[PDB]
Amino acid sequence: IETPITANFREGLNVLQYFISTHGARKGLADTALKTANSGYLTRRLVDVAQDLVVTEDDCGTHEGIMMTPVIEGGDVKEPLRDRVLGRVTAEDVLKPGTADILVPRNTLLHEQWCDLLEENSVDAVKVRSVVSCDTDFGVCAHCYGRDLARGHIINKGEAIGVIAAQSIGEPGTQLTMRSSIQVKNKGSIKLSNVKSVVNSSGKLVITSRNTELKLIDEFGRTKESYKVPYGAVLAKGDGEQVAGGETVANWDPHTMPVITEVSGFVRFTDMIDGQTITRQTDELTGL
Amino acid sequence: VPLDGGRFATSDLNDLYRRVINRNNRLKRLLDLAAPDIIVRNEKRMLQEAVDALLDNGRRGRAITGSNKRPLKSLADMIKGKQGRFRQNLLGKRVDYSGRSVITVGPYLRLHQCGLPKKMALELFKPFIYGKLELRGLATTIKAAKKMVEREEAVVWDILDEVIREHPVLLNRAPTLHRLGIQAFEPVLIEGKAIQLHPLVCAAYNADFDGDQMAVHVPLTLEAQLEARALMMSTNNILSPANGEPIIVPS
Amino acid sequence: VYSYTEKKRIRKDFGKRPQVLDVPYLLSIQLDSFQKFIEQDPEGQYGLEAAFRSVFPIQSYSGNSELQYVSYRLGEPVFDVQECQIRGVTYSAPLRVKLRLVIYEREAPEGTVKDIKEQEVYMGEIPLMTDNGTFVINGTERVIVSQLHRSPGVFFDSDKGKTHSSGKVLYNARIIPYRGSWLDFEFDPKDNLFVRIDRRRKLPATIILRALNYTTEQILDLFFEKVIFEIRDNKLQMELVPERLRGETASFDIEANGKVYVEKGRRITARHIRQLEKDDVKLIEVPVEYIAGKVVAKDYIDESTGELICAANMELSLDLLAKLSQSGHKRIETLFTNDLDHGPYISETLRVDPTNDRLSALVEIYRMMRPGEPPTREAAESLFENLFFSEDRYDLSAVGRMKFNRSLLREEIEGSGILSKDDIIDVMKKLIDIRNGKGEVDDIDHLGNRRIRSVGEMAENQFRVGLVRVERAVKERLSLGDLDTLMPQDMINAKPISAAVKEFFGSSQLSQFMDQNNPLSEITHKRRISALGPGGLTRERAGFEVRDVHPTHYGRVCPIETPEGPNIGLINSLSVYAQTNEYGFLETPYRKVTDGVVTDEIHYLSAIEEGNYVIAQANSNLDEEGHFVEDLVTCRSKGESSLFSRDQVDYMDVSTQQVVSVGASLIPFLEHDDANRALMGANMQRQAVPTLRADKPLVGTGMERAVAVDSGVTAVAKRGGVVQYVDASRIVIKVNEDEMYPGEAGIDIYNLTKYTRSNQNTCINQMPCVSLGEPVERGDVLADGPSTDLGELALGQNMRVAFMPWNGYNFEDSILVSERVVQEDRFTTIHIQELACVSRDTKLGPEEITADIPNVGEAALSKLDESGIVYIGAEVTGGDILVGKVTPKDSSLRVPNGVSGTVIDVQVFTRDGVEKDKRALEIEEMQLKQAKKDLSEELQILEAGLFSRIRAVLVAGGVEAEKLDKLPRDRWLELGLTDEEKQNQLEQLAEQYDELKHEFEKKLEAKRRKITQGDDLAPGVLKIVKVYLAVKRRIQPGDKMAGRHGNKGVISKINPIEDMPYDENGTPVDIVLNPLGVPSRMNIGQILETHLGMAAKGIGDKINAMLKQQQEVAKLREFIQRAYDLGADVRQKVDLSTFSDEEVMRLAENLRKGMPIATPVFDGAKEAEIKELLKLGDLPTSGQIRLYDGRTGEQFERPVTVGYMYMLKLNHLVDDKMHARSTGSYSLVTQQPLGGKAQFGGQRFGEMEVWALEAYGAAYTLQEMLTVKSDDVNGRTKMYKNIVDGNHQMEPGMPESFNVLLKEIRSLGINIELED
Amino acid sequence: LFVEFDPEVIHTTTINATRGVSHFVRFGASPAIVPSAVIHQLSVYKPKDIVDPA
Amino acid sequence: GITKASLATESFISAASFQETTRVLTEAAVAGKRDELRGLKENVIVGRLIPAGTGYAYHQDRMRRR
DNA sequence: TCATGATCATAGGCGGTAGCGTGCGCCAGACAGGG
DNA sequence: CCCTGTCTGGCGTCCTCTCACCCCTATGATCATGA
Ligand SMILES: [Mg+2]
Ligand SMILES: [Zn+2]
């Protein structure tokens, strides 16, 4: 509503302002009612799909795990490496960039001292053993799960983790809701990923790919900015270079799909017959 | 079931079986005295439709009813869904040695103990008191002990303080969402009629004190007392299983 | 001037807006609707006469007999309300109907009947309504609740977005009849037009247009315009109106008059349309490709061959033009089928049609109605005339015809109840217009489309269904018997009518049990707009939008009083000023603001008349004439609030209390509470309980007297006068002479209702509040009811509260209460439980109620008399014997284990024939003696009033000052006096006196008959003994108290007096709340209520100080006048100079416990007025006193807030919820414990608790939690032996309910087993 | 029971108010044209017995 | 998906204690399917120890003696 | 002594010479329509 | 046979507390009263 409520609860509220407040309040109450109605059924389906998975061995004996990197939406780093690789057994043994020097062995539970020693050396991506890549027939081994959450040590042989997992996912379901360019902030080296780029006549670096992802590598190894770069975007910089803060390095058109080229030559028409393939539509009020 | 009015409002199953046996006896009599050529057919259609009303009512076109709009209950309506044997009687049961009342604060508690009334502690813990009476020799049979604890004489409160002492109970809030919703305490007898519950613990139950009601259960056997002391005690669960955050945050 | 009970305790009133329309009688929906239902109503409608004139005359199956209708009449009920609630009968009245039978002759149904017979007939019993607005169905007082449902008429909804997953919206047009078959027109993504009837199979829509006998040429004449092509010497020229060409790109160069107008490749502009219509261009030239796809309208036939050239609704090709061109046709009529303007929806619909004439359409409609049977032309005609076009099976009401004419832009709002051809054609025209882009769809939740049924209309409909069943019986019997020998009571029987109306009032989804524990709860349960029930939506299905407040609930339906939980916004409560329109919609008052001046006439607006006009907000400032003092004023135009000019307004609201209901207008400072907390406060104010001595609200809203008087718990005076005899039982008013009838001399007797059971087991008492010799005015309280005081409304009590954290005992929401509260016996509520005991009839013989009982001794039988029934007054414990009963085996009634009480009332009912024992004869002699004394006192008291009238008449005209009392008093007529009005009046009083004599004789004989007779009872019961225990429940840790703003709480510790924080005067505070509930739960109104309550008590303490010192009335007059002026421009303006030195002392006697203050809802007391009233008393300005501690005796830092808050005890007590079970009874089909508290049961260890024990490693706890403790019978007997012998060990076994699962799966064709 | 009547012109719901009405011999959606085997080739019978069933 | 992953089990008692019981019992009836109590919820049904906590040690003993 | 009328007790599944139903919504997988 | 629409089946929170309601109508037989 374009005319806001200019009155607080210490002063009065007249009749219309209190009526608009009632719109908001009853919308919230009906949200909470039907929200609980969906949340309980979500907890039911999750504890009935898990239901059975018991920590039934002590070492599966594989290596392939998932790669834990800090998540980067394109602003501040939302979830760091300490809060993701806290207490989970490493897949491949992490070597510090003093290559052929082992920092952690390949079956070490990463508790808080090890996580601080990960944060000091600025470790890129601690590849770690996940439950989904296990090898235990009819159950899940103990090392691929991790720390016993709610306790300190490794998981005991036996605790039913499917049920505590399904309750931990469905329990905050009561709290949930129901119904142009690239601007940099920090400073560091510039990384490009999955790019097919070429040089324009202006001297810049233009792109011939939709799958281009720009990254900002910081001073110690990790990444603090990531940007999906569109098709045919124009960079003011290149790969491996150095920028400063507040410097927009890319620009494109979100309305137009550019069909930019690679080689320099004349333009001709092939299989373009007028009247059928191309039509004659004169732009009336502009001219071109 | 009798309704104490001289009549039997019957269950739906006896109605269904009675319909099948009526229709089947009439079909036996009609096959007996010869069917009129292209006639021994309507009665078999009726029998097939009565059996299809008995095995799963409402799956075939329009269901039957006794009174008045509500369709009555077949066998598949006793196995399926809610109000059926899988979800109402076999996965969650009604349980003896249990009770329930309204909760309150009482901040003089240590966090491994809760207040619990003298009347609830006397009615939950009856056979323990019977055993201590005929083990100390204050009643000959079980009936004298029952009449002693019905009269509530002056000695059974000492028996009750000697059976509560190191014996946990399970407290339970009614919408149990996560596994911290069932915890185990060591009771303290309270003059009154409410369950005094430690305040910090109410961060885990999501329980205020505006009329909330909690239910207490008793572990009878010995292994269940050890599981409600070593696994489920209120001092052990200080960390949540969703993360590493403490659940004893002062509110 | 003030009424005499308004000079007792005149409530201080803030408030600024001078009222112009007082609060109406709050129970007018129930009483006005049921008065509309049952009353002798001429000119047909509404009422019972509508049913009796729409279902009658029943004419027979061509037997020339006819059962027509004359009139009806209801006799008096055999039982009045009190005997009906005591015994347990319906409160019904017999419905006598005068029916007539006529029997026509042969060869002339337009000829003379040979014989008629008109007679009285009995049918049904309709239950009457009591003056409170409630029904008494089986001794239990029930309320039928108003339903909110869809208004009959057309309704153009739009199935937006969701269908076909391509964004193409649909449009449907549901015709909603009041009674009959529905009719849904709609579209489909192929842009065809589809009808359907009662959600059945789907047909193309024009199949019904052929069913109304339209040829296809006429259909295209209706639903399209015409395009004329004239073959005039050159290329088949065209008549052209260029308005069709608005934006169309032509295929050639349009030229006329030798001038190029339109070029090929361009579109026709609007100025080119202006050129062509200015030059008046008529005939233009088309190519051969222009009529390549033009659709012909009507059939062209060739005159030579007699064949068909081209069929109707067909596109034209080259050969069709070549055929019709050489046949002699110069005019060609086609249709205009544009992209935006007019789609060919009718044309595509007729191309999908297989039908060709009226008969095939009627066959297809008869086949979609009843599937798979041979149609016949007579059967198809009969079905399609009985779907929409018959007075029997189809009937829009007047509401339906109004909406159907209004939503089609008609003029007359009067029409027939049946449809016609023009109606369906206008529905299809408006649907095509909505599809074309002009006009709008109609929303559902708009209150111009939600009608309100009530008690009268729903009882009429159920009675009509009973009548169509009985016409289905009378049509059976009338032409299948011998005539003339029968009378019209042998035909019609009263079983279906009484069964239908008794099933509706007995068990419906809207005839619900009255929540009666409070006058507020009565008067807000009777005013309820429920959306549920028959014809409305359901809770577990719908939805989102109907649970939301629409912008047109403003002043009709309350926005903040609704039950939270599974049905929010469906159990809406109707507002204060909201009446009900003539048709059934909602309407609300406004003030007609003529061009400058707010005129004080009220003027009722409906929900759709409000939208067109523009309404000023309620609290807009105006300077003594009506001129709006601003030049921008906040208003609302069409469901949307804005800021308008000074004199473009058309209406102003009446009073500022009209958005809210009466549940949430007794909340002081409502404008300061957030709406969630106001909702919870209104709902808990409904859930209160009456205390022992209800006090008053110090901070009210002035709305208490409307809720108290306009309900039915107080004893309002009918005719004013002088009180003669006050007693705790009765009150006698002597009627003043300027209010009094000439005959029936008249002094009124009010028999109060003493201690009796309510529905919620409270104690509905009435206490007399008038003195003796006291004047009372017409319309005034005499006896306070439950939770009333001097005619006000006192739900809870007002106590001294402080906001401070006190050592953790008020942690989340808890409340901490001093022992000074429980010592004063001020929340000590009184409950009454009814315990019944029947003497059934079984085998080996009947039962025994006598006290010769086995297995019992002196200690049980000392509390019974010599005939089994407990005494009246014997204070029993939990588990004694009340009624001793033995069967051919002790089965005596016992007090259920836990409750104390005092037996206050014993009823004994005896089925007739059974021997009355000695106590039943004692109760019979007792009630004979009571009724004898009561009717004799009726005769004596009314004879005393009659003799006082004789003395008042004989003051003049032959007065005898000494001779009047020498003779006996019954002869005061033959004294010396001529033929005047006085001897005429003495003759009229002699007529009245002899009438009272013979009436007393016959009524005492009838009352002895009513006491002496038996009562019809259950099948096979001897006698019913009912005993009323009267528990007195005080307060304890665990009860629930709450204020009036949503501040709930379990009272957690009942402290001693000494521990309470006291102040530097000495007084301890009573209750210590918790401050932390205020900034999160935003109910800031309770702190303003606290400060204004402390101001009120400061004025009360100063009155108590000025009166305890025995001061003369001058200083009291001074101080009370200063406390009653005190404000801005207010409404009260009292002066004590017309109270005359004796009322001021009694007004100060009523003000010494505090001064009551009214604070209306949105026009309340501001902050500066509270400060100025706290300055009148010597209290601190900020409201905060420094408080010492009780334990340490040293001061709390940072001074704390004290005051008075008016707190309510709720009836969620703690010795009604607490329960415990070691080993009780077990269920029968699955050997698990029973459920509930009355059944001694165990708590459900539900499914999520099983998950929470799987989530730990607790395995033995769960095994005994679902095998030993619950189900396995041998396992639990082994467990019980092992527990009483000290061996904690379980022998597990199997759940018996799993064996029940095996038997239920095995009872199918399935073979489940257990291997190994 | 065998009854002779004619379906279309006389529509059934009018005649419904009487007995003789449970419904047609069908073996299918349509009211099945029945044979009259007793009337045509099986007139006089019941030599089974007069057992007076049970 | 989790409701189809829970209805598609090698154990008909779990898929019967979850959603539709008719389809699960008819498919397991004509298939002759043979549950072996396989985890938590079937043992909650049949009334014995969960194979999770202390019952896990009991089930290792019981399976070792097979 | 016989006949008639009235009252009381005991006994079954739309009620009628049709029509009642009408305000949930999503997903999903099979059955079939159109081409 | 390869889509593409329709159809009909599934499913839609937990725990507790309270209250009412749970055939009436028609036909046949027996008894009493009146002629
Ligand atoms: Mg709460
Ligand atoms: Zn593994």
mmCIF file of N, CA and C and ligand atoms in Angstrom, chain A residues 57-64 129-136 139-145, ligand 2:
data_model
loop_
_atom_site.group_PDB
_atom_site.id
_atom_site.type_symbol
_atom_site.label_atom_id
_atom_site.label_comp_id
_atom_site.label_asym_id
_atom_site.label_seq_id
_atom_site.Cartn_x
_atom_site.Cartn_y
_atom_site.Cartn_z
ATOM 1 N N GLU A 57 29.498 -50.860 9.984
ATOM 2 C CA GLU A 57 30.891 -51.277 9.941
ATOM 3 C C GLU A 57 31.770 -50.205 10.567
ATOM 4 N N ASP A 58 33.076 -50.378 10.405
ATOM 5 C CA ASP A 58 34.048 -49.510 11.032
ATOM 6 C C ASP A 58 35.041 -48.926 10.039
ATOM 7 N N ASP A 59 35.188 -49.527 8.862
ATOM 8 C CA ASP A 59 35.958 -48.949 7.760
ATOM 9 C C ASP A 59 35.507 -49.626 6.478
ATOM 10 N N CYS A 60 34.985 -48.849 5.532
ATOM 11 C CA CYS A 60 34.590 -49.426 4.251
ATOM 12 C C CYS A 60 35.812 -49.816 3.437
ATOM 13 N N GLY A 61 36.725 -48.875 3.242
ATOM 14 C CA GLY A 61 37.938 -49.129 2.494
ATOM 15 C C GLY A 61 37.897 -48.616 1.072
ATOM 16 N N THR A 62 37.446 -47.380 0.886
ATOM 17 C CA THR A 62 37.503 -46.708 -0.407
ATOM 18 C C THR A 62 38.208 -45.370 -0.265
ATOM 19 N N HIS A 63 38.324 -44.682 -1.385
ATOM 20 C CA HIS A 63 39.007 -43.404 -1.433
ATOM 21 C C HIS A 63 38.134 -42.289 -1.972
ATOM 22 N N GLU A 64 37.225 -42.595 -2.889
ATOM 23 C CA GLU A 64 36.482 -41.568 -3.612
ATOM 24 C C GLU A 64 35.483 -40.890 -2.686
ATOM 25 N N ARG A 129 35.543 -37.707 2.754
ATOM 26 C CA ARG A 129 34.763 -38.921 2.527
ATOM 27 C C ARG A 129 33.324 -38.699 2.955
ATOM 28 N N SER A 130 32.397 -38.905 2.034
ATOM 29 C CA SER A 130 30.991 -38.663 2.286
ATOM 30 C C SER A 130 30.234 -39.976 2.372
ATOM 31 N N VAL A 131 29.036 -39.894 2.955
ATOM 32 C CA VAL A 131 28.186 -41.060 3.149
ATOM 33 C C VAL A 131 27.693 -41.594 1.815
ATOM 34 N N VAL A 132 27.473 -40.704 0.850
ATOM 35 C CA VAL A 132 26.873 -41.086 -0.422
ATOM 36 C C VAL A 132 27.832 -41.886 -1.298
ATOM 37 N N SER A 133 29.132 -41.821 -1.039
ATOM 38 C CA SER A 133 30.117 -42.526 -1.847
ATOM 39 C C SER A 133 30.726 -43.707 -1.107
ATOM 40 N N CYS A 134 29.980 -44.310 -0.192
ATOM 41 C CA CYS A 134 30.513 -45.365 0.649
ATOM 42 C C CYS A 134 30.500 -46.698 -0.094
ATOM 43 N N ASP A 135 30.868 -47.761 0.622
ATOM 44 C CA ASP A 135 31.018 -49.070 0.011
ATOM 45 C C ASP A 135 30.422 -50.177 0.863
ATOM 46 N N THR A 136 29.886 -49.859 2.031
ATOM 47 C CA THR A 136 29.372 -50.889 2.922
ATOM 48 C C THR A 136 28.054 -51.428 2.388
ATOM 49 N N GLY A 139 24.135 -50.867 4.789
ATOM 50 C CA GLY A 139 24.477 -49.968 5.863
ATOM 51 C C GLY A 139 25.547 -48.991 5.428
ATOM 52 N N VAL A 140 26.094 -48.275 6.402
ATOM 53 C CA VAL A 140 27.080 -47.215 6.184
ATOM 54 C C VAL A 140 28.200 -47.398 7.193
ATOM 55 N N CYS A 141 29.446 -47.354 6.732
ATOM 56 C CA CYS A 141 30.577 -47.536 7.635
ATOM 57 C C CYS A 141 30.736 -46.329 8.557
ATOM 58 N N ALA A 142 31.615 -46.466 9.540
ATOM 59 C CA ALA A 142 31.720 -45.419 10.545
ATOM 60 C C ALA A 142 32.601 -44.267 10.086
ATOM 61 N N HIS A 143 33.654 -44.536 9.318
ATOM 62 C CA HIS A 143 34.567 -43.459 8.955
ATOM 63 C C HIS A 143 33.988 -42.530 7.908
ATOM 64 N N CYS A 144 33.117 -43.016 7.033
ATOM 65 C CA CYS A 144 32.581 -42.100 6.036
ATOM 66 C C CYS A 144 31.515 -41.169 6.590
ATOM 67 N N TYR A 145 30.996 -41.422 7.788
ATOM 68 C CA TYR A 145 30.007 -40.509 8.345
ATOM 69 C C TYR A 145 30.682 -39.282 8.936
HETATM 70 ZN ZN ZN H 2 32.513 -45.943 3.570
#
